[PDB]
Amino acid sequence: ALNPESADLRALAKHLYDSYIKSFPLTKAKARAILTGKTTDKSPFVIYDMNSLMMGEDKEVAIRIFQGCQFRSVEAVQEITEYAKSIPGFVNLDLNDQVTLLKYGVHEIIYTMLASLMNKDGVLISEGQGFMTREFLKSLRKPFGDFMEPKFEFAVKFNALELDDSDLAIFIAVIILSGDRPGLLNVKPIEDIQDNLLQALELQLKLNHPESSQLFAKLLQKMTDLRQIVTEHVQLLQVIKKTETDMSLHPLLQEIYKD
Ligand SMILES: CC/C=C\C/C=C\C/C=C\C/C=C\C/C=C\C/C=C\CCC(=O)O
């Protein structure tokens, strides 16, 4: 009994999933397959101590690792940015609002997808070839040992929803196209787009998780969690700025944070 109205939403869902697969080299599906011994050819090298770290590379630890994450983030911003362009209506919006939606949405999206590469013990690195334990990270020199812990806590709770890539594709689209962003010139156009995006997600979740009662509301509530993650990460950098005057925060990343 898929009426003609709902039929339009499915088409949107498929389009986004398609652009999602095409913009992100390491999907949750692949991540899970690596993480759960579902292989012998895609198993990762593990880093849990200083020795394994150096035995893993095939300037100091804490700093070297931080610069690393910096490189990746910027790469992610680039991937998320290319995904944005595929969202119907996004490029058609005011150029300025396009920049605002990205600057405010990029990190909320990065933490959402990061969960895909995490389990309670650690996180995949280098496109899945490596796996760095939570303990190792939670032990790095202060205050770097506090950088990852908050994301892990999100991940663990967030992964309980058991969402797959097709679900995520729409969710992250909903995140970007949010009219309540600071400095938006024309909120209306943006809200019209989020409206059917939320309509797409709801059907998507409905059909794909017929048993999960109120999955739509549970997922939307998680959006609060992402926000706090961003908030405290920000003041964390402010500290790193002061304590490490010789460390360089990538310009692209520095531009996103003037908010
Ligand atoms: C361990 C670093 C070395 C290589 C990186 C390879 C893959 C990266 C994947 C996971 C690494 C762990 C965290 C990085 C993920 C997101 C960035 C973390 C915080 C955001 C920092 C920011 O953008 O300000």
Is the bond preceding residue 44 a cis peptide, omega within 30 degrees?
A: no
Question: Whose CA is closest to atom 18 on ligand 1?
Answer: 69
Q: Domain extents for the chain?
A: 1-259
Contact assessment for residue 17 and residue 166, using Cβ atoms and an 8 Å cutoff: yes
Closest CA relative to residue 155, chosen from 202, 125, 214, 110 = 110
Closest CA relative to residue 195, chosen from 3, 9, 47 = 9
d(CA 87, CA 89): 6
For 8, residues 6+ apart whose C-beta sits below 8 A from its C-beta are 196
C-beta of 209 in contact with ligand 1 (< 6 A): no
Look at the chain and count its residues.
Answer: 259
Both tokens assigned to 205: 């979740």
Residue 36 CB coordination number (10 Å): 9
SS (H, E, C) 25-94: CCCHHHHHHHHCCCCCCCCCEEECCHHHHHCCCCCCHHHHHHHHHHHHHHHHHHHHHHHHHHCCCCCCCC
Q: What technique determined this structure?
A: X-ray
For 32, residues 6+ apart whose C-beta sits below 8 A from its C-beta are 38, 116
d(CA 126, CA 149): 19
C-beta of 47 in contact with ligand 1 (< 6 A): no
Query: In sequence order, which ranges of the chain are alpha helices (DSSP H)?
Result: 4-23, 28-35, 50-54, 61-86, 95-114, 134-137, 149-158, 165-176, 187-208, 215-243, 251-256
Provide the CATH number for the domain formed by 1-259 in this structure.
Answer: 1.10.565.10
Please tell me what resolution, in angstroms, this structure has.
2.5
C-beta of 125 in contact with ligand 1 (< 6 A): yes
Mutate to test the pocket of ligand 1, among 26, 58, 69 (most ligand atoms within 8 A of CB): 69
Is 257 one of the annotated binding-site residues? yes
